[PDB]
């Protein structure tokens, strides 16, 4: 099936956005984790925690 | 051919923000990736391209990159007109490919919305169908539940919702519910209530006319 | 404007298609002037709807 | 300033054909390439075709390789796309762009699009009601009216207020596909209670597919 993963995007200003990924479970979650990772190279060193069997992140930037 | 994978589907962020999309090409395709950006039912508006080029008279918060087979468009300050799809394009071979699009929403602070109904004009009761409509007006967030009572009968499958595109100055959403019956069913009955539930709201609001009332 | 003898083949083709209506039959004969390269791809296409409305 | 304008599209039966046209201005499309790119309702862009009108040199989606043909003529500055064996998925906004103009490899300027709906059902004229103003649609002082548009195929409609010269504050809805296959949509707008039975106000709509103009006046009941 298709999901939808939701992130919260919460940096160390504590500027939060949100953000969306759609495909297959496995796809959708190795989109948001590539996303993070991209972020934290601006926004520093990167922390996801994983809700509701994975459905839904929290990923904090360390700034 | 050459795939154009986008992410996320949807950012969400408030003004002011940076915000950043993303776009990877399944093969390399150099520098050949062009940016669109698309709002208000227009056409495609080129931002960026060449992957890092900014086209002429496109604001300087636009911002294209690029790593590899991994693009990205960033913008610096996000505004409020900013809110719409973006598209990335390879032109690195034939066919040209698009991504399949972000949508970019401004995040703001909570407004109830305005709720208002409307009972059937009497010009359309003269055809057989009643159309009952009730009006959120200006609110922030989108979600909303809107439930029509017809002589306190909840209704089911008899509604359809229309909701505004995100307003360009205030990033605030309308939104529309319509109840249609026959003109039948409609003299049939007398209270028609739409509930409205919305985070603004401290609790559900109900609009209601009796038909026949001025 | 003129044409080889391929061309007037393609057009002799579509315009002998017995199911095809007149608005089909003019807009495939219509590609064919629009695009000499896509001969082949375009008489492919109106006989596939040529044999659908037998 | 450059500008396209893409024309010619319609409502078009299951293997019926089509013709679009791409009329070019301020520039010459001898100097560039020309793409058809279409968009279904609600889904992302999809390269349809390009040509180099100088050379003729044409390339074509897989998807509609043999059904459609483009093609160019310089001495109009006008590209076109014949659209034959239409199918319901074709159904699209079709816009044209140009590419490579001035040095710039991508698609610079577009064209407004030009809506081809591909189906068996008819035309149809919408109907026009008022929404009128009244003690249910005010508060804080402002009043909300509005028009509703109803029963019509194919899109598009179009609504303005007191022939564009009301603006602020309006609210036209996207159209909505209903269980009987016509379409619907509602505009409102939100005035100054103050004003009513003082200002007229009157939407315009245009449904071009069957001639429509209606001048609807709304007032209270």
């Known amino acids: 099936s298709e999901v939808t993963i939701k992130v919260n995007l919460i940096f160390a200003d504590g500027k939060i956005q949100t953000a969306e990924f759609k495909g297959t479970f496995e796809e959708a979650t190795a989109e948001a984790y590539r996303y993070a990772a991209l972020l934290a190279k601006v926004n520093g060193e990167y922390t996801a925690d994983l809700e509701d069997g994975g459905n839904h992140m929290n990923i904090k930037f360390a700034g | 051919d050459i795939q154009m994978t986008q992410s996320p589907i949807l950012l969400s962020a408030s003004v002011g923000d940076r915000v950043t999309i993303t776009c990877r090409a399944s093969?390399?395709?150099?520098?050949?990736v062009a940016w669109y950006q698309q709002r208000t039912n227009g056409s495609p508006r080129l931002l960026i391209y060449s992957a890092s080029f900014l086209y002429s008279g496109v604001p300087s918060r636009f911002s294209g990159s690029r790593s590899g087979t991994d693009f990205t468009l960033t913008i610096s300050s996000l505004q409020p007109e900013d809110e719409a799809d973006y598209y990335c394009q390879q032109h690195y071979t034939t066919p040209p490919t698009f991504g399949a699009g972000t949508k970019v929403e401004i995040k703001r602070t909570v407004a109830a919305p305005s709720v208002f109904i409307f009972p059937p004009s009497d010009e359309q009761l003269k055809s057989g169908t009643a159309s009952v409509v009730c009006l959120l007006n200006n609110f922030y967030p989108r979600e909303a539940k809107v439930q029509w009572k017809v002589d306190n009968a909840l209704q089911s499958g008899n509604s359809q919702e229309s909701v505004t595109e995100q307003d360009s100055k205030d990033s605030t959403y309308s939104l529309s519910s319509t109840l249609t019956l026959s003109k039948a069913d409609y003299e049939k009955h007398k209270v028609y209530a739409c509930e409205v539930t919305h985070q603004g709201l401290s609790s559900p609001v109900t609009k209601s006319f009796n038909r026949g009332e001025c | 404007g003129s044409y080889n003898k391929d061309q007037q083949s393609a057009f002799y083709e579509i315009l002998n298609m017995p199911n095809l209506n007149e608005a089909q039959r003019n807009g495939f004969i219509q590609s064919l002037k629009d695009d000499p390269s896509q001969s082949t791809n375009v008489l492919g296409e109106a006989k596939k709807l040529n044999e659908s409305q037998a | 300033e450059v500008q396209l304008v893409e024309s010619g599209g319609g409502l078009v039966q299951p293997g019926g054909s089509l013709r679009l046209s791409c009329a070019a201005s301020?520039?010459?499309?001898?100097?560039?390439?020309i793409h058809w790119v279409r968009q279904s309702p609600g889904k992302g862009l999809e390269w349809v075709a390009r040509?180099?009108?100088?050379?003729?040199?044409?390339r074509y989606a897989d998807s509609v390789k043999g059904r459609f043909t483009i093609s160019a003529d310089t001495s109009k500055n006008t590209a076109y796309l014949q659209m034959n064996s239409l199918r319901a998925e074709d159904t699209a906004i079709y816009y044209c762009s140009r590419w490579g103009g001035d040095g710039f490899y991508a698609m610079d300027y577009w064209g407004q699009g030009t809506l081809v709906t591909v189906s068996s059902a008819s035309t149809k004229g919408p109907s026009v009601f008022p929404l009128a103003p009244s003690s249910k649609s005010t508060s804080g002082g402002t009043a909300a009216l509005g028009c509703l548009v109803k029963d019509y195929f194919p899109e598009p409609v179009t609504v303005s207020w007191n022939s564009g010269a009301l603006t602020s504050g309006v609210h036209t809805f996207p159209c909505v596909l209903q269980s009987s296959g016509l379409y619907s949509l509602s505009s409102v707008v939100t005035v100054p209670s103050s004003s009513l039975g003082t200002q007229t106000y009157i939407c315009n709509v245009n449904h071009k597919p069957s001639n429509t103009k209606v001048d609807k006046k709304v007032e209270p009941k």
């Open positions: 093969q390399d395709v150099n520098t050949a």
């Open positions: 301020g520039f010459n499309i001898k100097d560039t390439y």
């Open positions: 040509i180099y009108p100088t050379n003729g040199y044409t």
